[PDB]
Design a protein around this ligand. Sequence first.
Ligand SMILES: NC(=O)C1=CN([C@@H]2O[C@H](COP(=O)(O)OP(=O)(O)OC[C@H]3O[C@@H](n4cnc5c(N)ncnc54)[C@H](OP(=O)(O)O)[C@@H]3O)[C@@H](O)[C@H]2O)C=CC1
Ligand SMILES: *P(=O)(O)OCC(C)(C)[C@H](O)C(=O)NCCC(=O)NCCSC(=O)CCCCCCCCCCCCC
Ligand code: SF4
Ligand code: SF4
Ligand code: SF4
Lengths: 334, 185, 153, 441, 49, 337, 82, 115
Amino acid sequence: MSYSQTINSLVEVVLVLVPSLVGIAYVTVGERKTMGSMQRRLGPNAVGIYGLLQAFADALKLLLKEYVGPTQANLVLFFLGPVITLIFSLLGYAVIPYGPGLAVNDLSTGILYMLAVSSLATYGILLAGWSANSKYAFLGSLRSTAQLISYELVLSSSILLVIMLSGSLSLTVIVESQRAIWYILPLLPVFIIFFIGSVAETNRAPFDLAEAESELVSGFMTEHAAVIFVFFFLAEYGSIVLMCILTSILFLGGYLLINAPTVEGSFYGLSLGVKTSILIFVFIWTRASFPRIRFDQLMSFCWTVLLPILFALIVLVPCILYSFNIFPVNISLL
Amino acid sequence: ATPAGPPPKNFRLPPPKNWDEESESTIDKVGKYFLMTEMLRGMYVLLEQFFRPPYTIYYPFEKGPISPRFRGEHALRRYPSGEERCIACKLCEAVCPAQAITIEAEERADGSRRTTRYDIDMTKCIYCGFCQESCPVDAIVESPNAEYATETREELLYNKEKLLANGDKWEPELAAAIRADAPYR
Amino acid sequence: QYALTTLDIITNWARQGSFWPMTFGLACCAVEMMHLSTPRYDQDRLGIIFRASPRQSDVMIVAGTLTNKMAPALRQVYDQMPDPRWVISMGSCANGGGYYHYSYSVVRGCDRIVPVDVYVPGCPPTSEALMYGIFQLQRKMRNTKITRMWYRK
Amino acid sequence: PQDGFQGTRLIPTGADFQSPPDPFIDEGARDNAANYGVQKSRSGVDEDSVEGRKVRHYTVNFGPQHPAAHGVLRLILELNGEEIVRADPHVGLLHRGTEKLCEYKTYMQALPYFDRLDYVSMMTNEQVFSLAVEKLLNIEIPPRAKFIRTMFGEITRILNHLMSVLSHAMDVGALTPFLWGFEEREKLMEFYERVSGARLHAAYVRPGGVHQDIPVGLLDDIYQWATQFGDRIDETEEMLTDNRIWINRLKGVGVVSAADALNLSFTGVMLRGSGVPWDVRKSSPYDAYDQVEFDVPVGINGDCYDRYLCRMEEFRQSLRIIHQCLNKMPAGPVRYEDYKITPPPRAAMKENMEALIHHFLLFTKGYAVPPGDTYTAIEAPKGEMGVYVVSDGSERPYRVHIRAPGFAHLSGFDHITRGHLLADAVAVIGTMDLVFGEVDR
Amino acid sequence: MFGVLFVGHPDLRRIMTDYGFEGHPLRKDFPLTGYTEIRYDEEKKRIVV
Amino acid sequence: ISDIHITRTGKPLIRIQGGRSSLGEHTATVFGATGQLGRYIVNRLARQGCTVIVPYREEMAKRHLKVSGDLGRVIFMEFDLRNTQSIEESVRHSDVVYNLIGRDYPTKNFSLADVHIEGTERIVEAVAKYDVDRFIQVSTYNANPDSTCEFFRTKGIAEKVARHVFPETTIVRPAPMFGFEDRLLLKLASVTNLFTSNHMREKFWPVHVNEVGEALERMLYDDSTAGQTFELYGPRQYSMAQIAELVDREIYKKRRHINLPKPILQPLAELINRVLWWDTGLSRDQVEREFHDQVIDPTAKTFKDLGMEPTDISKWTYHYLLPYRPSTYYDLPPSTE
Amino acid sequence: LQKVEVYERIKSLLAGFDKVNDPNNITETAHFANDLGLDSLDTVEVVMAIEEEFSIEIPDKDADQIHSVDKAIEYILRQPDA
Amino acid sequence: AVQPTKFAVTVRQSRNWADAKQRVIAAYRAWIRAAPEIQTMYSIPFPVSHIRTRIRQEFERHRYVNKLNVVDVLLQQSNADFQETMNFWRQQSHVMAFFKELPSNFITGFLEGRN
Ligand SMILES: NC(=O)C1=CN([C@@H]2O[C@H](COP(=O)(O)OP(=O)(O)OC[C@H]3O[C@@H](n4cnc5c(N)ncnc54)[C@H](OP(=O)(O)O)[C@@H]3O)[C@@H](O)[C@H]2O)C=CC1
Ligand SMILES: *P(=O)(O)OCC(C)(C)[C@H](O)C(=O)NCCC(=O)NCCSC(=O)CCCCCCCCCCCCC
Ligand code: SF4
Ligand code: SF4
Ligand code: SF4
């Protein structure tokens, strides 16, 4: 190579983490300003020009706010759960292609990597809620466990239908395969279902049961203050963007367009971000449109509506592939 | 339950309709179920709100609307000569519903019936306006002022010195509010 | 002194810009309080979002009458609110008991229970009067000496 | 009294006059699905009277510091997992002794207390107290006051329903309709603050009419608002009525039968939701109601969904009444023309002797109300709001008792909620439309 | 409020007054402001009567 | 004790006794009241209707004191020790001046000598300048101008300066204090206090802070306490090891300490105190006190001279240490072993 | 249990009670009221103390029956807990 | 109807003095049985002996009542105070307001002002 391995690895990680953590801060302001417009409001417009420094004041305010360790709380776990949720939520950005193979890890199995990292971070929510040893946080954590028993099979079922078309499990190859057609056209029911599960996966509304404010006070994060609360917020909003990126990876062609490398690489980055930003809007639009579902009804919806339909596609879709001679070669090509 | 006499005509509900009596087509019913149709309409209605003017005003640079009858902080008022209008009748002390007014009077050096004490406990007041309603001479009024929040509660115990100072400062509105609202009183 | 002021500036600017009151309210003053969250005043445009939990709250606004049956609960959730913390007393009832001052069941002002940083007059204070008291408290934050205080001791 | 010192005849009790059901026609051990195995004693082994007093269900204090508590309620819930086995609402956390304080006030001095009971429905609370004193005063308030009180009575009804229905939707998770409807109520508090000097506690409706006359631009601005308020009702209708998440959160929830709703002291939508046609403004017309046309929304399933559909219809019926009042507003005084009861105009008080004496006596002594007692009830936005006023013949009431609709409703909470989940309790608090200024008094 | 027993009543307890409250405040002989009042005490770190 | 108090300057005070709405007739000034002791004297004076001037430095840390008294009762004045005017403005309406200003450790602008000697000098010189009746200065136990510990020496010289300027000084010497927010029981239940020079074997007669605030209240009413010297100590002698044993029995935690040799620890402790901005519990002199032992100097009045009998620290461990019990042992009754 | 074991602990408890007239009067057939000078409330405390020591719950119906030491001994043997 | 709470007892009149006699003993027993349970619920730092002393004194103030209708009001109040305490509706301040932890002579009263 031309320069050091460690430096190339260094600047690539920075170019991924730093712009993403900046992107996370603006989704929080953007949601507050988007719902307000739907609510005939303005949203943040006085912490920085047009309100563009609001997330930083919120972040800085909490890192200077006193932490409390409850006497009834198992304290090592009280701190371990938010730290697990944050680290393991942010790890999911290590396999996103911002171009063909332009990922921190172009892994051959990056889809399974994302399922492992998301599942491990939800276990922090469960642990932190239980550790608090307060009723509402206890009821919050039990809902989060019910919720993962609801959406995890749904996403894993949905993605397996994308892998049947792509044949790869590598995020770049799936995007490259969509140069034929975006997977939202042939897999239109799967796109709706995967999007529904992603909203449930992120504990976003209408599925905000674990942290519901009108039923529990803050659910799992009710005893959590200062930096611990901020760890859970960055995990949640970083999960929203990551799931919007993954939905764009799997159904909307990823980075596909709708000095010379820099000009080209920019178009891939914009194209992925534009499609991600549209799906980020759909989340915020969804929180603003609907009531909260009841947690019994979310479990029944995933288990008697979504999964029965997804199992039937899992049968139907390969039968269409063998019939039309369109099973993808599973070798390395794209 | 229902009114006595003949029962209301057609108060009894029609017999229930069966599943195969509902006159909706399967294509429509199944389409609405799977396409999430009614909730797409709600999503759209939010979209046209998104492209409507907001309602928001930029307080404190812009203020919401208040009327001449608005009841704000208290002020004691004077005649055009600078003589106090208050004559110590004690009517407002009597009518107060919260006993926030304490008045002590005497004959002044010149033999005038004037107050020696005039206190309003602004943390006992209910801001009803009954005291300005009862005044025979338009002395006690409630200003259009609502922005007078303080650091301590001692700052909310107004004596005659604070209330006359309020009238001395706010007289142009107090006069314009009375002018605009007097015929209705 | 220049650097210790700058830390004080950046600290107080954050406390001002992220001003989260508890979603706690006792009676009709809470009606005017929730009208600051509605489109006309849009309390979020200034960074003010009501948090349900006292663990995620910066300020408690006492918007309502404090009865003797509630005083243990007001004090308990105030203690459970982390530092830095502030109390706004909104209304005559929370100020000095108001119209129920001569009642057998009413605390004659919430500052017999908790310390109070700014008092808003009115029953009810108008939505703008409460905003004026929140602007007093942020002006008090902006003049609060934190890092230059330690430098004096 | 004296006989009670030693043992005497025991005072008869409802248990004594119990009667055995007839076995020929009796069918079933439970004609009610409220007690159909969705309460306590449906699990475990032994009852909680002996050997069970040592254990507890999962008990959680739902409030007071809680959003769904909407204020100052301490609802002690016993949960079997996520299911409610027993609900014990604890109130009195906003009890401030209003009914005792009224006894050391003149009748004028007590009227602002009624502003602060159901404190989203101020002018309606004022009306029920103004109609009880006017009945004991044996006076007939003028026609313009009756039309102002019915028009501001329905402006108040819309204001309450905006707070009630959209707070209830906020609890279930729908945020946006709350924001839209609070611009409309922010519009309507201008009409309050233009006739009175207050956005909330007007002190406007008083025994004898209203305090002042409406200003000369108010009727045109009320009509201008009226020409667009239909669209406001329809866009909130557009997010909830057909929403499938709204329907499955409220349909079949908080079900009360018609015969139990009467036995529970339910009134208003809580009663009309169960299929009973009952409106206090239809059955005992007061003010100008018997001079206007309006429909009465009545549900058929007695659940949270029917109660929601009845309240969204009352938006449209209140706007319908308001239009007729604007059209039928007569000229004349807004105060009964007797200065021994109502204060004289300031002009007359500064110009004439008998006007000054009457102004002086009405603000120091108050007016005397002829001795007697009365129960007076009106269709408040939350149900039958009533007052029992006892009169000495003097200028201070001997007894003022407020019959609050939400006091009667929160008492039937455990009856309709035991067996539902924790979210369904949130749903039932908002459909039952509680303000604890009236509950505690 | 008045102190009237209701024989046969299930769960007859206070509904309006504070928990430890003694007296019946709607009685005429009960004084308007009562007998006691509360404050938070700095030395004891609690509400005292 | 009576309805009439007559002061040294001879002014009478006609008192109405009970409640925060009544007339205690005394105007006190309490320097150093935002610390640990200062609230108990201020609550005692304020809740009996006395005007209390509270000279403060940091605005947000004084706020708990206003709750103690009625409206207009607790007056906050913002002062500095090296601002003589603010000192003089604070004591000149007063009939009693409490000096509770002290610091265990040196700071970058105050040495132990500067906060004890010079701070007392200004406070006492203003007490003399405006002829204030009573002056209760709080020194420490083991205070001695011939001492070698900076704490016990400097608080021993301020004792002599106060008497030399205002001979009617009531000098009060408390033992190490326990209570709510005490730096005695809460440090032994903490996890930061791991370093130590002796084996926690130094002895002292610990005294409840609640009974010391009561003692300072009684010195105002017992005028004969003027010009006297009071040592306010507890009923038993304990080591740091015996106290730490009680704490472990109560919190159920079995805390542990790392012992260091004093020629090694003391230099480090002087570095931590000089490089950290917060009270670290560690400093060169606090290590020196750590090796010293408490002596109750005779010819000094006691709690009995106030007619008070102090209670033992053991009776108070459950009340103050319960927040530190782990959830498993929290629901248990007090140890009472 | 053993009869002598379930009696020895009672004497220590009964003598340990503050205001019995004299510790000698406790016998196997002694009465709380007639002999040991205990009124209604003192006797209820004594059954309460006996139940706590034996770690058993004495029900309202048979709690009243224990007005003498012998009755306490027979109930302790009858109830199967220690 | 709505369920009565955990310790809710139906309000019934005492049949005779024997009835009242047995109820008062039942109430006194139930209170002193619960004193250990009150202590850990309310984190009382005093020992249970003091708590039971206070229960005894409350019962002793109604010792000399010879009226069935006054005893039954009293048996009502204790039932509600017991139910209120055991369900943890009241809090520590209320329970500590119950523990108090007048001049003893004319001359002592005179010299201090009345008391
Ligand atoms: N507590 C104990 O174990 C013992 C205490 N003592 C003495 O008792 C007194 C009270 O004890 P305690 O309340 O626990 O002590 P704290 O250290 O908690 O309080 C000391 C007080 O002195 C003030 N103060 C310190 N340095 C300065 C300064 N340079 N300028 C102005 N004010 C200053 C502090 O104000 P601020 O908070 O603003 O800094 C604080 O209010 C002290 O004098 C102490 O030395 C003696 C023996 C034992
Ligand atoms: P023996 O024949 O001596 O019988 C003794 C008794 C007491 C039965 C008498 O001989 C007797 O019959 N006297 C009349 C009845 C009587 O003493 N009082 C009526 C019973 S009700 C009562 O006394 C209630 C007392 C207060 C409430 C219970 C005590 C506990 C209060 C709270 C404790 C701590 C809570 C935090
Ligand atoms: S009513 Fe008016 S004029 Fe009369 S005493 Fe009161 S303020 Fe003065
Ligand atoms: S407006 Fe205020 S001062 Fe006037 S009568 Fe009403 S409560 Fe009293
Ligand atoms: S101050 Fe007025 S508006 Fe606020 S709670 Fe009290 S009575 Fe209601």
